[PDB]
Design a binder for these strands. Sequence first.
RNA 1: GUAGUUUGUACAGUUUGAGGGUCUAUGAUACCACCAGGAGAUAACUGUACAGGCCAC
Lengths: 749, 130
Amino acid sequence: RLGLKQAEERLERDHIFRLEKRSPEYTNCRYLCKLCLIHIENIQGAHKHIKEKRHKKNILEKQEESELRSLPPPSPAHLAALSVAVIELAKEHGITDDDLRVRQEIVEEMSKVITTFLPECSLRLYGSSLTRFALKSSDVNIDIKFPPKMNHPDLLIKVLGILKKNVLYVDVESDFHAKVPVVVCRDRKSGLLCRVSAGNDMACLTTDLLTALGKIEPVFIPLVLAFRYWAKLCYIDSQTDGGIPSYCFALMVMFFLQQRKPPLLPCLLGSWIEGFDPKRMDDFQLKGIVEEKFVKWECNKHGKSPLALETPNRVSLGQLWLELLKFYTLDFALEEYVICVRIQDILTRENKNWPKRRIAIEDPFSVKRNVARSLNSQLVYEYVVERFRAAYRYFACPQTKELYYVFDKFILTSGKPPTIVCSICKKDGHSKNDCPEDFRKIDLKPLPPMTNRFREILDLVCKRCFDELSPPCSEQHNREQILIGLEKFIQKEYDEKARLCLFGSSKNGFGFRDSDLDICMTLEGHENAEKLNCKEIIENLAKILKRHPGLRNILPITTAKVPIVKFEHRRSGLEGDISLYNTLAQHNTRMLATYAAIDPRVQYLGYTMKVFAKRCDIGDASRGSLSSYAYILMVLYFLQQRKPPVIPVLQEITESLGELWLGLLRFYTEEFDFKEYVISIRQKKLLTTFEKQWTSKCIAIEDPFDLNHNLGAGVSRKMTNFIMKAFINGRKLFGTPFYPLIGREAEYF
Amino acid sequence: PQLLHGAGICKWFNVRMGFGFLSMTARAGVALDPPVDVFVHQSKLHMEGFRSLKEGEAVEFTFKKSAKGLESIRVTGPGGVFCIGSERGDRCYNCGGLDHHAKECKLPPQPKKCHFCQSISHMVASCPLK
RNA sequence: GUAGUUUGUACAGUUUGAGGGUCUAUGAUACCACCAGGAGAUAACUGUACAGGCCAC
Ligand SMILES: [Zn+2]
Ligand SMILES: [Zn+2]
Ligand SMILES: [Zn+2]
Ligand SMILES: [Zn+2]
């Protein structure tokens, strides 16, 4: 009996504990690791749980935590040295009030530059720059307040172009893909970063809240200079790289000053509000700052709340700076609690219905959304805890020289580069340069030299997909005979004004030999279906075709642009459609047929795309992939982007075939960005996803006429990965030379 | 191999320097009465690593005659298996045995018992009678 | 609220990597000397726990 009680001590040595009652899902499991949070079944499995590499990293994590948990408390000489270190960080290159004036001069100069071209726009310095919660080499936060009679991507692009033309604010970037689309630049006079945003008045009100707190308390100004210098010394500040924003770090230390007993900043909502309730705190909407001492609030009756304690209590900056890292390494639960400073009380994840596996912070004036959503990967979070550990290990250890401290790179980085989760795919285990789904990085395997025999093989493979599916002229004769017969039948039965016009699979250039007879109806004296009772015509024609002993498969459909009837000719056994003055679908089909009629290579490449998508399990939208219509659209988009544009833009008004298709695969692997640009015809410009706001969707393959739904907005990103794998295979299986059996070339492909 | 085969037992073998003598009961596939003595070296043992022989174990060899006496050119175990070595490579931490190892071990876990005095109070490296 | 096409980290088993005092040669009658308390170091596949990513209902 006691043998098992002694054997379990080795398990208990690293966080294994037996569970009294069965879990709702982990029923048969009996044991649990505190560090792994994964239920365990039996003792031999627990030793098998000991061998887990996840449990191996967790043990080192806990050992580091316990190692620097018990550093000796700082001496008064140590406190004085820490105070000297934080004031020299704050004064030598950290933003002082003099450097705050320098930042204000920078923003005023940039405002002069912008208002020279955009006088209706107005620049507001805000954010981590102005708040006196800054850093030595911060990025300036600037909001643009503009009249609403303009496009926000258009003004952002214009500001980006102005800054690119400007020679002072160098290093202009167009990061329009983050949670806030921001222009980036670098002020040369200060030599520090600057950024441009617009419309984030919630963060402007938060900035005013923080700056009022700063005019109240003095330790405000050095504390986040020190904290943000640690944060940029560990590369946690890059929210684009899965980190946490600098403004969120400002809010983090504001919550610290709120919660560091005895408190040094008062909260915004409290007991002085008679009739206040913690649960309905989101209903207490706040407003701007009055006299830099109060915050306004109003319910749709109003009032103001203090931002000051009536005595600015003075404690040493070194003690504050050490206990900040104490709080945010060993005292405050980073993931369990949302960092919420609207109330002194602890606010959980489900209280704002947010996930529970990383850090969440709330914007004071945007309490609906989590501003700390950029934390995704668990490994990056554990590295962040490790960097907090390295900071607390150094700064609470006495030094030799004489006590002296300096924010060295190597003491906190420990030589290890930061665990940057991939900013493109947001998946751990690989860096930004290691993203497989990155379109632009697919260049690691340049092609072997293209033999002309290989070119002939590719030409034959691309040609066979068309010629095996090309309709013959006798089918055209049969279809026009069925056309005139159906015209005579509908005229003699339903309405003599009915005239027939072949379109679609008979006449779009994409139909096959046994395709459907898609026929448009026209009425004498009627140029549109709006004047016609479409449902009555559809149902009467359906009844009459049912009465026809020569036409079968009759069925009305109302899901098209105008209601249609699908049927089948019994004698030819040929399916077909009847469409009444299609509103747009017919115009789009006519435009596609005109694009086909401009160059038959469009039909050749499209048939090749259809067959190659079929063999790569992505044949049509009936199988969940891109439609053959979408395939034709992206083919036409490639022909546009293959400069000089092989097809033109109708709305704006000599490569070999196998190499044309291989160049389509090459373009849709690496020469084109799906997440950044739009596959659409309407403009010759490389239409960005930021222009059309389809950054939330995977692939922006947009119809030039059907602007309502992006075709790729119906297509998943894992289907995007599948078709990207198909394109890469076309670069490899179809794009590298091979000499298979005659007729088996495409089958081998 | 060479026609001068043989079989027998291991009379003696030094682990440290790596040679010995075998009591051969067979000579070139023909049984002997009485057995004779044939020299063996560690290099004659067709094994990888630091080859060695356990005294008293059975061996099959191909031998030769030299000036110093009979010497076994190539020596293996019965059926071509590897040899053992003089025995006077780590035990299972689950069970204290070379029979299995811990991943292979499926018996329920054992208390931390010292090997020398067979007591669960202490570990064997801190045994008082060691 | 739920399915769909998918990343990591672990998961149990299988197949390969050190066999886990590994390592170390000194060719003709002797070596094995002198312990840690530690549940075993990768690559591949299968099944998978969990969050992240996505499209539709
Ligand atoms: Zn565990
Ligand atoms: Zn990636
Ligand atoms: Zn065992
Ligand atoms: Zn003992």
